[PDB]
Amino acid sequence: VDTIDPPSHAGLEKKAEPFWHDNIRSKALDSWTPADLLAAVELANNQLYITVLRKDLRKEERIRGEERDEGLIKDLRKQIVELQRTILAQRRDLQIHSHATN
Amino acid sequence: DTIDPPSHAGLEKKAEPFWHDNIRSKALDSWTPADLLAAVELANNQLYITVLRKDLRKEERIRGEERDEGLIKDLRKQIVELQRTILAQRRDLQIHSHATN
Amino acid sequence: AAVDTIDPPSHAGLEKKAEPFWHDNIRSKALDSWTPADLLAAVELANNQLYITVLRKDLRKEERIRGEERDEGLIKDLRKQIVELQRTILAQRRDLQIHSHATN
Amino acid sequence: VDTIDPPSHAGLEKKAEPFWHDNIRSKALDSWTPADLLAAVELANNQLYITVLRKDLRKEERIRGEERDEGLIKDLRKQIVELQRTILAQRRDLQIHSHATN
Amino acid sequence: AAVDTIDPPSHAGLEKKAEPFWHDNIRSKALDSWTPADLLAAVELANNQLYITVLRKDLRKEERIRGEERDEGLIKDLRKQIVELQRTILAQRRDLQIHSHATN
Amino acid sequence: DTIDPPSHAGLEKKAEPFWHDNIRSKALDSWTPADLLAAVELANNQLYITVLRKDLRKEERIRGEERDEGLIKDLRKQIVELQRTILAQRRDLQIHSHATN
Amino acid sequence: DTIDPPSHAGLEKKAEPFWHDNIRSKALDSWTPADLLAAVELANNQLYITVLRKDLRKEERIRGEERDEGLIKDLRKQIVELQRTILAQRRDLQIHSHATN
Amino acid sequence: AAVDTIDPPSHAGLEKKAEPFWHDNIRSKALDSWTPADLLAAVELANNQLYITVLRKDLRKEERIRGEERDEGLIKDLRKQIVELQRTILAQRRDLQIHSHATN
Amino acid sequence: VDTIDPPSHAGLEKKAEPFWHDNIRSKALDSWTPADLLAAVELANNQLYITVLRKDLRKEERIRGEERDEGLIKDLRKQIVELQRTILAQRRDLQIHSHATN
């Protein structure tokens, strides 16, 4: 009663569900249009994905010597920053950035 | 409660549920023919993210010599670029939240 | 022209298959607000909208190819070309005042 | 009586003339300064040139097999987009974009 | 949580050593103005602030190396990564309304 | 009805008709010495587009082994960059249409 | 008349005089804990410019075969990027001049 | 200085041939509105305006060369350097409030 | 009495001192915060450094034949432009750009 189910067609990853519900609960339930719900799937999927990439990054950072892959480490660092910046834009698009909600 | 997509614009069949969600997010009488064309591309992009994510997750499950790090990197970026484009497409159609709330 | 539209300027080279896109755009603001300059710009808008469908067909063909003949570089380039067309179209809509903010 | 001749020194291509006159007729004749007329030559030349590049592109796209030039196709696609974006800026500079005229 | 802060959302994966950064940020606007969405965003802010200190340690280690084993490329990349994190953090602060313009 | 260009700025001789067109597009008394320097570069750029287009068209007429696709690509871009610069130069001088209309 | 830096943020010891100068440039009661974290990075960057300039000047004094033009170029750019970042960091903290004057 | 201008600051290194550019710029806003900081900035503006003429001379020389000694790369680089100077000069004018919007 | 000493820790280069004092004298002495003084060191250092790089550039430009280094010439030209653009931002940050002072 205090949230909204994700649209099935949009492919919310199951592990993104706790992120999804946090975002839905950050503005009035009646202000979520069907279009907004589609966009919110991608926000939640991105927030989940940062945690996945950070795990990969930390794994690669623990490797020392010949098998260490500096290129992959560099790429993962950048991918995380790009996701973070995208998420800020996604929040603003949904009016769940702080300026709107606070 | 909705509008049929313009045939010439080539809405992908699996993009239909995305299409209808977007059409239902502003008043039916505010959809111009130009807007309907733009909305086909929005829906096609929203569908396509799901397609590229499926490809990405497949590549991520591959371990060892056949794993393709370059392809993984390229797919990650393609998804981000689609997402950013979709935000612009929503604003162009006035179905971003600032307009509809 | 039909009484609810405008013919495209011949010199601008509207593609035949772009015609249904053209008419959709023309019909999205008042007929009397289309200047001759705007009509030139609208040809390029319609041509771009058509061209996305053409590139998507090429892309889907390339995506169905598996094994040695698959061309990952071409697939990457087509994905980007479609996004660049889409973004250009948004600017072209705004330039013509047929984006939603203007019309709705 | 309803248009203006292009400045000879500016090098309007002859096939760009129908584009030129369309643009001149899109704001009041008395609002065309000599500076604007120079700028309008380049607008018209660019609008013509898109049609030229599209013809080249379509020619290259019809070629299949060993002689197909994917690099040239990619370059022409980008050149057309860059011209289109430039033309939007050129229209705004001349106040013949729709916001000004409509 | 302590009565002047908020627990981080477990699913977001706040790093243990990011906790003191987390609490500093939470305590920089009213507790009741933290939406669940904001709390997710704040995890990434805190994780980034921690990560700068980690990268700076790696950088300083590489800078102490002289001769054949010195890796100028890695040093260059780490310098840039730190600047990119710093710039991202400024955007993350503004998104949360904990930049100075909002709070002061 | 016009102003002589500052000699030190090196207005190209064939840029003169461009120069005078620009000078005549705002009040003569509003041309500061600084503006006159900037206007030399505007006129020189407007002339130079015509020069580069002549080179480009020459290269485009060449077919076969001597055709230089790289040079053609570079000239196309140089022209676009000049055009975009000219728009900025017009705005800097307040001879863009928004100012003069 | 000042505030201690948060230990977890890793203010470099030689950055301390920079830190205190920045803290003293707006009211003490307007420094939130979040601002104090951001100010550590500002001070660390201000210190680091001096470090990179020392390295740059050392490389510039080298003549002949051991001179490293690539390193010189990279250091020049790193300094400019730090400087630009610092301007953004000042604005974020409202210690740029527009805010404090 | 002549009574309608200001001497350049010696430490800033105004090029001798940049002097006529310098004086044109100084004379484009009130003498009393030139701060010492502005005078430093104006040295760089004048030096850039002079330098365009220098680069254009080099470019025209290279453009007259035909055959094996022609250096297309250098020609390309000089064209871009001139455009970058021109764009920088517009920003330098605005920074000094001697762009037309300010003065006219 | 009409200027301010630079903060020692900030590493103002000695040859940048005349630039420093010119900038300090371009707004009211009481409006220079300690933070502004740090920033002003980097402004002055950059203004000095343009003169240094121009000297290097002119030296390289006088070299003809096999020893001429076109890459270095290109890099120095760009470095000067980047410094100049940075200085404009540094002036605005300190409110000693003309819009603020005039």
Residue numbers in the entry:
A (entry chain B), D (entry chain B), I (entry chain B): 23 to 124
B (entry chain C), F (entry chain C), G (entry chain C): 24 to 124
C (entry chain A), E (entry chain A), H (entry chain A): 21 to 124
What does the paper say about this structure?
By size exclusion chromatography with multi-angle laser-light scattering (SEC-MALS) and native mass spectrometry, the HK97 TerS measured 160.5 kDa and 165.020 ± 0.005 kDa, respectively, in mass, corresponding to an oligomer of nine 18.3-kDa subunits. By X-ray crystallography, we determined the structure of the protein to 1.4 Å resolution. The protein crystallized with three subunits in the asymmetric unit around a crystallographic 3-fold axis, ultimately forming a 9-subunit circular oligomer, in agreement with the biophysical measurements. Of the 161 residues in each protein chain, residues 21–124 had well-resolved electron density. The N-terminal region superposes loosely with the α2 and α3 helices of the helix-turn-helix (HTH) motif of pac phage SF6 GP1 (73), the winged HTH domain of cos phage lambda gpNu1 (74), and the N-terminal HTH motif of cos phage PaP3 TerS. Two strong helix-breaking proline residues, P28 and P29, prevent an α1 helix from forming in the HK97 protein. Following the N-terminal region, two long helices form the basis of oligomerization for the HK97 TerS oligomer. The HK97 oligomer has a van der Waals outer diameter of roughly 85 Å, with an inner tunnel 55 Å long and 18 Å wide at its narrowest point. Residues K36, K37, R47, K77 and K81 form a positive belt around the outside of the complex. However, positive charges from R86, K96, K100, R107 and R114 also line the inner tunnel, which is solvent-exposed and almost wide enough to accommodate double-stranded DNA.
A large number of double-stranded DNA viruses, including tailed bacteriophages and herpes viruses, use a homomeric ring ATPase to processively translocate viral genomic DNA into procapsids during assembly. By contrast, pac systems feature imprecise, sequence-independent cleavage of the DNA concatemer during head filling, giving rise to variable genome lengths inside virus particles. Both systems encode a large terminase (TerL) protein, composed of a viral packaging ATPase domain and a nuclease domain, and a small terminase (TerS) protein, which recognises the cos or pac site between genome copies and, upon binding of DNA, recruits TerL to make an initiating DNA cut. Here, we reconstituted in vitro a cos packaging system based on bacteriophage HK97 and provided a detailed biochemical and structural description. Crystal structures of the large terminase and DNA-recruiting small terminase, a first for a biochemically defined cos system, reveal mechanistic similarities between cos and pac systems.
